[PDB]
């Protein structure tokens, strides 16, 4: 004779998707205003096997949506460059022809007066028209609205910790060689993820986490995470020492450009150590053999400028100092949106960055799966029912 007994506090959970909030120790500091745990706790769950799937992880989709929303809200209250889209009279500034000095007739704050203004554009920002070869328009002029980023709003990525709402928990896979799918036999429970840097790139993954033991290749040879021996530190620079200029295109709407360049014009570039890259490629091939314009270049945000580097000296080898030229682009469609673009105004002085290569994409959300692959969100269900011999009075 068994009776129903209700137990509250049962250590069980089920898969669930909920809204996660972010915390951090600038758009990211403003958005992720919740402070982090100064000494985060983690509980190892012994004798627990949990199935993970990094390609069905809704934390990646939420991270993506939060990034798109934050970029849209950050650029929304900023100057829209619609007074432009006029024929430009461009003369070469110089490698020669990469930067042009373009003049144009723009209506200023007063609607009765036209002014002849000058601005500096990169070859990638303008499209030639007519047969004069000095008549140009902005590359995205007739298809999109180009919004100038506010000069006081920084998009520099900082570590972001994703935290579950109370009542939910994040399970972490502690198998250092886990391939991103299937059962994990060393599972721990955390409230917040590690610090994830929302870095945006197209080929090489810069900054972020590193594999604890060896290079791990995850697919289904697609996403490669570099072992404890960090891959090449990549030193990228824009040597052209610029002086920022500002003109007005309407009441309260200032357009920023480059007024002059001090010294000689030089090409932007990135320096990758040759021996370390050769060792990285060798180790990647060893692991691969166990199983057997904007989309052909390495894009990244360096100092606030958008670099497009020619990654052809890195992936031109056959198996069993490397200076990559880079172009700088100002008018971009960062998220491939229809009808929208950002102008990303130029920064004066010179720019130098030093980034850590942590992984590779061979053959977007894939830039972040490489960080969130070890986490899943579950819902806690503390109410359980089981038979006992005890009966209520």
């Amino acid at each position: 004779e068994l009776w129903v007994t209700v137990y509250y506090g049962v250590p069980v959970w089920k898969e669930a998707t909920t809204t996660l909030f972010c915390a951090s120790d600038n758009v990211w500091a403003t958005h992720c205003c919740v402070p982090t745990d100064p000494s985060p706790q983690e509980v190892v769950l012994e004798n627990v096997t949990e199935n993970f799937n990094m390609w069905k992880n809704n934390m990646v989709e939420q991270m993506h949506e939060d990034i798109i929303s934050l970029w849209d809200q950050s650029l929304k209250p900023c100057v829209k460059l619609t007074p432009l889209c006029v024929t430009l009279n461009c003369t070469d500034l110089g490698e020669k022809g990469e930067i042009k000095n373009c003049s144009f007739n723009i209506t200023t704050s007063v609607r009765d007066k036209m002014q002849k203004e000058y601005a500096t554009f990169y070859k990638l920002d303008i499209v030639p028209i007519d047969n004069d070869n000095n008549s140009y328009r902005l590359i995205n002029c007739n298809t999109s609205v180009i919004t100038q980023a506010c000069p006081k709003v920084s998009f520099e990525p900082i570590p972001i910790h994703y935290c579950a709402p109370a009542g939910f928990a994040i399970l972490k896979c502690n198998n250092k060689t886990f391939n991103g799918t299937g059962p994990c036999t060393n599972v721990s429970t955390v409230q917040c993820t590690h610090g994830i840097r929302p870095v945006v790139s197209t080929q090489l993954l810069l900054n972020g986490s590193l594999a604890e033991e060896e290079i791990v290749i995850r697919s289904e040879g697609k996403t490669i995470i570099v072992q404890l021996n960090e891959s090449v530190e990549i030193n990228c620079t824009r040597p052209n020492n610029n002086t920022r200029k500002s003109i007005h295109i309407g009441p309260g709407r200032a357009f920023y450009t480059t007024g002059q360049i001090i010294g000689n014009i030089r090409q932007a570039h990135c320096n990758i150590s040759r021996a370390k890259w050769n060792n990285t490629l060798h180790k990647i091939v060893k692991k691969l053999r166990e199983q057997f314009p904007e989309i052909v270049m390495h894009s990244f945000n360096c100092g606030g400028e958008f670099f497009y580097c020619n990654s052809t000296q890195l992936f031109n080898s056959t198996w069993y100092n490397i200076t990559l030229p880079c172009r700088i682009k100002q008018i971009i469609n960062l998220w491939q949106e229809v009808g929208k673009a950002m102008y990303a105004p130029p920064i004066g002085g010179q720019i130098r960055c030093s980034s850590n290569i942590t992984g590779l994409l061979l053959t977007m959300r894939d830039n972040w799966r490489s960080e969130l692959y070890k986490y899943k969100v579950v819902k806690i269900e503390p109410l359980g029912v089981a038979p006992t011999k005890c009966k209520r009075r």
Partner: protein, 120 residues
């Protein structure tokens, strides 16, 4: 720690940490939704414990008999050699039926207490 005994047998859990962790309270739409949902989950669990006569307890004994249809295993193989995950997830899909029976029993008990003047 929290869920530390999740891999232990059902009779070995003896946990209070997982309810302490449930004392949820110790642009702006997403935070309001998260806070409202946390409140709703707290209140729903408290409501269920209330209507079952289980408020304030972690182990609540009821007067509903166990039906072998739901599970025909003996206690020797339920509280030992099995975890709470396996019990609740793989061999228990009668949760709503059992809850309804618990609620009916609690309501019958309270009405019986009101009707029987020897308790009044």
């Amino acid at each position: 720690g929290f869920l530390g005994a999740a891999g232990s047998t059902m009779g070995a859990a003896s946990m209070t940490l997982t309810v302490q962790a449930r004392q949820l309270l110790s642009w702006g739409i997403k935070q309001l939704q998260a806070r409202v949902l946390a409140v709703e989950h707290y209140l729903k669990d408290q409501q269920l414990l209330g209507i079952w006569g289980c408020s304030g307890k972690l182990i609540c004994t009821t007067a509903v008999p166990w039906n072998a249809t739901w599970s025909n295993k003996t206690l020797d193989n339920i509280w030992n050699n099995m975890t709470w995950m396996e019990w609740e997830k793989e061999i228990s899909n009668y949760t709503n039926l059992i809850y309804n029976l618990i609620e009916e029993s609690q309501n019958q008990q309270e009405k019986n207490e009101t009707e029987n003047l020897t308790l009044c």
